[PDB]
Enzyme design. Structure first.
Site, short mmCIF file in Angstrom:
data_model
loop_
_atom_site.label_atom_id
_atom_site.label_comp_id
_atom_site.label_asym_id
_atom_site.label_seq_id
_atom_site.Cartn_x
_atom_site.Cartn_y
_atom_site.Cartn_z
N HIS A 9 0.83 -1.20 0.00
CA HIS A 9 0.00 0.00 0.00
C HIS A 9 0.86 1.25 0.00
O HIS A 9 2.02 1.22 0.42
CB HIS A 9 -0.92 0.03 1.22
CG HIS A 9 -0.20 0.21 2.52
ND1 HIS A 9 0.34 1.42 2.91
CD2 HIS A 9 0.10 -0.67 3.50
CE1 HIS A 9 0.94 1.27 4.08
NE2 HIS A 9 0.81 0.01 4.46
N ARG A 60 -5.56 0.30 5.55
CA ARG A 60 -4.74 0.86 4.46
C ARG A 60 -4.37 -0.19 3.40
O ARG A 60 -4.26 0.13 2.20
CB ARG A 60 -3.50 1.60 4.98
CG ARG A 60 -2.47 0.71 5.73
CD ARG A 60 -1.48 1.63 6.46
NE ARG A 60 -0.42 0.95 7.22
CZ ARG A 60 -0.48 0.67 8.52
NH1 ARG A 60 -1.58 0.94 9.22
NH2 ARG A 60 0.56 0.11 9.12
N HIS A 184 1.78 -5.13 3.57
CA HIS A 184 2.62 -4.03 4.08
C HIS A 184 4.10 -4.34 3.81
O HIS A 184 4.44 -5.48 3.52
CB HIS A 184 2.36 -3.84 5.59
CG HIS A 184 0.90 -3.71 5.93
ND1 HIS A 184 0.28 -2.49 6.14
CD2 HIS A 184 -0.07 -4.64 6.07
CE1 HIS A 184 -1.00 -2.68 6.39
NE2 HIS A 184 -1.24 -3.98 6.37
#
Ligand SMILES: O=C1c2ccccc2C(=O)c2c1cc(NS(=O)(=O)c1ccc(Cl)cc1)c(O)c2O
Ligand SMILES: [Cl-]
Lengths: 233, 234
Positions: A9, A60, A184
């Site tokens: 992200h 996110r 991530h």
């Protein structure tokens, strides 16, 4: 010749990606959102299709996945979320900028944490503004006291991501399912380390780009047949 | 009561506006439809609703409605299960036609009959239909058997393929204590409401579920409602 795509992200609100966002559930900034849209657009232009998607329980990454699925017209795909793909838990450092971290813990210790694969930051204590926000968040209610981190070294992050890769993602790949993973920096590091069999030093120097699809071509043994490729201009 | 169930019909679609039969066609939300779903989510947020699992169709108008709700209630982390079985009724040959084209081709009398019938299907979508490949050959239906993939559906057919998912996949979750959110379509939700309230064929056809408004059920342990459905909102 399995094909695997990873996406990291982009930018999160309030400069949090430069503030050890960690397990704090920061949203994408409008810019981080646009990055995801560009990446999804790149996957569409290239005609990519998926059969299943994996992401963390952090918004996110999830919103990144949504943006991508939207862009490639595959909102109907099954989606699996797991805390095991969460960002590294930065403990007491969560939310602090570089200057606050240095002022609080000193340049010497900060350098040690930065270069170490197996030394965690200090635990997030009850006085930390995020303590109850993260540790008592309902989404982690089923985790055992062992499993729910108060802090993680990179080694710890990778240790809890890999069992998910082996037990849930691998089987799908071997069935010919075309997998997309939206997660991530540090959870993706764990997958990339295992894929390419990198060393601790090498993985700590690896910085995956954000918002860009990362493509792996894997052989029958889930070993890469070439270096990772990126999609876009 | 023992359990709480929330249902929501997708917000207004781009084709709801044009008065075209969507059915299995994957029409997106209109901007107004998106605002409806957002208001629905805010109502759920204001009343403090929490869910443990969500079910939806494989059509984006329902999926996007769910996404908008989850965003509003800060529960984007919930597991989500998608199934063709919660899809809108398959309108067969009527798919893609508007009100005028439908009456022009079939006459007001036939349209009246289709409209009021529980078990009479519209004409089948055949290979020369302009949406045949777009729907019938969409890979999202690749795992359906030959007899599961409809060319058309009566309301009876729709409820007939929705209820098995309800009984086999949703009911056990509810009885496991999971707080369920279902974001789907008027006709697939009709099947659930008919079963919950044991309604007659005529009663269910008179039931109009509004786009994007959350519907709450308080259920006993046998999943019988203890009171009438309640609409949530302003
Ligand atoms: O023709 C149908 C119909 C046809 C076949 C099965 C079911 C229905 C049906 O249920 C229905 C219909 C028309 C209208 N009114 S209409 O303004 O002609 C119309 C038309 C098409 C659309 Cl997409 C929207 C509205 C309704 O209110 C209905 O409930
Ligand atoms: Cl989802």
């Amino acid at each position: 010749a399995y094909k695997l795509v990873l996406i990291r992200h982009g930018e999160s609100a309030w400069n949090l990606e430069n503030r050890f966002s960690g397990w704090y559930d920061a949203d994408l900034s409008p810019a981080g959102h646009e990055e995801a849209k560009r990446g999804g657009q790149a996957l569409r232009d290239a005609g990519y299709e998926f059969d299943i998607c994996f992401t963390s329980v952090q918004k996110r990454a999830i919103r990144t996945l949504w943006t991508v699925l939207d862009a490639i017209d595959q909102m109907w795909l099954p989606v699996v979320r797991t805390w095991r793909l969460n960002e590294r838990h930065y403990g007491g450092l969560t939310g602090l900028n570089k200057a606050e971290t240095a002022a609080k813990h000193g340049e010497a210790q900060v350098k040690i944490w930065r270069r170490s694969y197996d030394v965690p930051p200090p635990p997030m204590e009850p006085d930390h503004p995020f303590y109850s926000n993260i540790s008592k968040d309902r989404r982690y209610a089923d985790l055992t006291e062992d499993q729910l981190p108060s802090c993680e070294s990179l080694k710890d992050t990778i240790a809890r991501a890999l069992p998910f890769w082996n037990e849930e993602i691998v089987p799908q790949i071997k069935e010919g399912k075309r997998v997309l993973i939206a997660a991530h920096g540090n959870s993706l590091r764990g997958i990339v380390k295992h894929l390419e069999g990198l060393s601790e030093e090498a993985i700590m120097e690896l910085n995956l780009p954000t918002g860009i699809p990362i493509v792996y071509e894997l052989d029958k043994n889930l070993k890469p047949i070439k270096p990772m490729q990126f999609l876009g201009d």
